[PDB]
């Protein structure tokens, strides 16, 4: 009954589409047509972290909003003191093909991974004075594109084998594997309550997952190309997705739809990174065209450009206190903007 | 300013000094991206992601195998942007065989397609290629048993291995579309020891001399 199953799938997709069309009575643009514009915010670079001798592929702030970890293809994992530009640590990696890194919320650990297919977790706080590998998580058949510490013992990792996994660090075994994507999963974002997380893959589909259950609650489409960056809205009820179709999109969870489209006719390059601000009024996206744009998340109006990098702005991050935004790039420099 | 702050600054200076030392150490060690089968034979000749390190005549090499990576190359080939050279391996015996992995298209068509994609990337514009046209011994018998027309219907039939291998080689460098900027160093892999490694060493030495001239502003 293959034809019957295909017909059921098609009619059920059409039911999805009709239910989404019914609840689209208005638009975020129409409702926000009355709110005053943000203006033209010009952030100035404050620090410039130097010491990487290759492309920077990932950065992650610390929950203290002062320490940040950087991953680069020179095989080093540098822990930075952003206020003083000092180097707290410099972890030498077994493999130099690191594509992602994360900072533990407590600050005790740091993770990284890449084309060696292994998420390596490093103990920053040891009695013998150095940083050592505490665990090598190896169950993925494709390169790790993202990883986020769910707590001090759980980590959720996405890989380019179309699967994300939830790991248990103390045993090194993956509690829950998240299947359903038809393409390589590129990014990953954890909800503030850490009960859900969104993953955007190379199939131009963003899925909303439940960590405890292990199922895809809700699948979001709309992008014309693969999604490289994903980020939750601060209240955990929406998320934005930067892709390769030169367009960022704000999807809603309670409505199951796209709210706004952040596109300009000049920008024809993909989005490497996406993050919100503390209030959610600003959306910062880094592009292949050497810089980072600030978007009005409610008006879809560009409100600034962070033009300070001589290569692709790969990683991007906003502090938990909202004070600064840090952009890394293939030019081997991290800059703190404010 | 404070005592602990000055001590931390000294720690950071030591860290940066070791970083600079490691960077200048790694600057003069040659990276080789191996694509492709013959890859196993080539990597055994000088003997996730496989990095095999060999030393030949006071020079340090690294060879990267990415065969196990069954993902989109567009998502991680920019990582390998910046390598010294690319080693491409082609089985000359795989011209009469079909079904590369499971399809109806024959081999030496998939090989040429992958060669065209790698050779013409936006990333490998200044990156030389070392072609290894392997499987000569099998080719000797295969060209006699069956004509070359099977793989190439538009071929002038002359099956003696003296110029059919030359025809395959000529097509492979004809796939290059940015000549006068990139060089295809082609070699027919002989099983003799200390022969392929010498070819790689000569090609890489030429590439190094080109790069130093470019840094000097001459070439």
């Amino acid at each position: 009954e293959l034809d019957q199953l295909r017909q059921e799938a098609e009619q059920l997709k059409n039911q999805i589409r009709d239910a989404r069309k019914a609840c689209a009575d208005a638009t975020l643009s129409q409702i926000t047509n009355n709110i005053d514009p943000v203006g033209r915010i010009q952030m100035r670079t404050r620090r410039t972290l130097r010491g990487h001798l290759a492309k920077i592929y990932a950065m992650h702030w610390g929950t203290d909003s002062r320490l940040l970890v950087s991953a680069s293809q020179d095989g080093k994992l540098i822990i930075w003191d952003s206020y003083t530009t000092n180097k707290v640590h410099a972890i030498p990696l077994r493999s130099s093909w690191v594509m992602t890194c994360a900072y533990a919320p407590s600050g005790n650990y740091v993770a990284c991974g890449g084309l060696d297919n292994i998420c390596s977790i490093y103990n920053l706080k040891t009695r013998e004075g150095n940083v050592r590998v505490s665990r090598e998580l190896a169950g993925h058949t494709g390169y790790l594109s993202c990883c986020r510490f769910l707590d001090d013992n759980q980590i959720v990792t996405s890989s380019g084998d179309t699967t994300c996994a939830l790991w248990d660090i103390e045993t090194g075994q993956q509690t829950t594997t998240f299947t359903g994507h038809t393409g390589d999963v590129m990014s990953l974002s954890l909800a503030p309550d850490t009960r859900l997380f969104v993953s955007g893959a190379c199939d131009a589909s963003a899925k909303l997952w439940d960590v405890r259950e292990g199922m895809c609650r809700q699948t979001f489409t709309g992008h014309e190309s693969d999604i490289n960056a994903i980020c939750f809205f601060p209240n955990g009820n929406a998320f934005a997705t930067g892709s390769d179709d030169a367009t960022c999109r704000l999807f809603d969870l309670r409505a199951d739809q796209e709210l706004m489209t952040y596109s300009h006719d000049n920008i024809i390059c993909g989005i490497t990174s996406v993050s919100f601000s503390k209030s959610g009024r600003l959306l910062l996206a880094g592009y292949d065209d050497f810089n980072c744009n600030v978007w009005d998340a409610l008006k879809a109006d560009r409100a600034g450009v962070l033009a300070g990098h001589d290569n692709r702005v790969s990683c991007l991050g906003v502090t938990d206190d909202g004070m600064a935004v840090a952009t890394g790039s293939w030019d081997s420099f991290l800059k703190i903007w404010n | 300013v404070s005592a602990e702050d000055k001590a931390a600054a000294e720690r950071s200076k030591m860290i940066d000094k070791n970083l600079r030392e490691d960077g200048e150490k790694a600057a003069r060690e040659v990276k080789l991206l191996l694509l492709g089968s013959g890859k196993n034979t080539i990597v055994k000749q000088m003997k996730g992601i496989v990095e095999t390190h060999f030393t030949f005549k006071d020079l340090h090499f690294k060879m990267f195998d990415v065969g196990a990576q069954r993902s989109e190359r567009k998502k991680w080939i920019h990582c390998f942007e910046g390598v010294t050279a690319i080693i491409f391996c082609v089985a000359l015996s795989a011209y009469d065989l079909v079904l590369a992995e499971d399809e109806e298209m024959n081999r030496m068509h998939a090989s040429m397609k992958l060669f065209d994609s790698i050779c013409n990337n936006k990333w490998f514009t200044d990156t030389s290629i070392i072609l290894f046209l392997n499987k000569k011994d099998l080719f000797e018998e295969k060209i006699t048993h069956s004509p070359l027309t099977i793989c190439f219907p538009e071929y002038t039939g002359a099956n003696k291995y003296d110029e059919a291998a030359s025809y395959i080689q000529s097509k492979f460098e004809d796939l290059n579309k940015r000549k006068d900027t990139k060089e295809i160093y082609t070699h027919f892999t002989c099983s003799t020891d200390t022969k392929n490694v010498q070819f790689v060493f000569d090609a890489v030495t030429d590439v190094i001399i080109k790069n130093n001239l470019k840094d000097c502003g001459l070439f």
């Epitope: 002062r66 707290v88 | 404070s2 702050d5 000294e10």
Partner: single-chain antibody, 230 residues
């Protein structure tokens, strides 16, 4: 971790002796090292400091030209070559490791001690002996002469504990930063000059002598010592 040290003994006045401490477990090269004296019936005094990488070297005014400090990282040893020994140089010498970065815990492990016998911010602890019994709370006070609150929001006052027969143990490195394996009943508070340590649920193993020492300026200064007795 182990910082074992030897080289003490009886020496005539005006002679020369060398002390040596050998590190065992931790990464010796990444730690700065201190020499701290403890006179027979007196408190703790600071002698020298050798920076990680042997960059910066500091001495007390008493031992500036006479004593010298050097380290051998490949051998994992720290030396103290003492010259012109006088009767005030008799003490039990401790080797203290200190790593310095953001959030570090300086002065965390001490050595056993070597007995050598020869034939500035003012840190004050008015109390000299507090009569205590197990069960209730104890507050130990400590005042300074210069405000230890830096412009970077850090107060550089550490806390230490010598039990009747052991080397000092760090309790609170920053104003209120509890050490690694110290029970949560310890705490600290203050603004710039007035400091206090509050043990909440005292027991037998918490009795000893408590010192407060500043890390604001190079001549690190300890206190007289506040003693808790059962």
């Amino acid at each position: 971790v182990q910082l074992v040290e030897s080289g003490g003994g009886l020496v005539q006045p005006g002679g020369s002796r060398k002390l040596s401490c050998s590190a065992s477990g931790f990464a010796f090269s990444s730690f700065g090292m201190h020499w701290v004296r403890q006179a027979p019936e007196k408190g703790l005094e600071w002698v020298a400091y050798i920076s990680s990488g042997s960059g910066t070297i500091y001495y007390a005014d008493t031992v500036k030209g006479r004593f010298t400090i050097s380290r051998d990282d490949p051998k994992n040893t720290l030396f103290l070559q003492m010259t012109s020994l006088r009767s005030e140089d008799t003490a039990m010498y401790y080797c203290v490791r200190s790593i310095y970065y953001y959030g570090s815990s300086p002065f965390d492990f001490w050595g056993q001690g070597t007995t050598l016998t020869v034939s500035d911010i003012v840190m004050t602890q008015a109390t000299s002996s507090v009569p205590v019994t197990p069960g209730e709370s104890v507050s130990i006070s400590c005042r300074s002469s210069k405000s230890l609150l830096h412009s970077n929001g850090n107060t550089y006052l550490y806390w230490f504990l010598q039990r009747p027969g052991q080397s000092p143990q760090l309790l609170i490195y920053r104003m209120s930063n509890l050490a690694s394996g110290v029970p949560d009943r310890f705490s600290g508070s203050g603004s710039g000059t007035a400091f206090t340590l509050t043990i909440s649920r005292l027991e037998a193993e918490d009795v000893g002598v408590y010192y407060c020492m500043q890390h604001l300026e190079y001549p690190l200064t300890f206190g007289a010592g506040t003693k808790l007795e059962l």
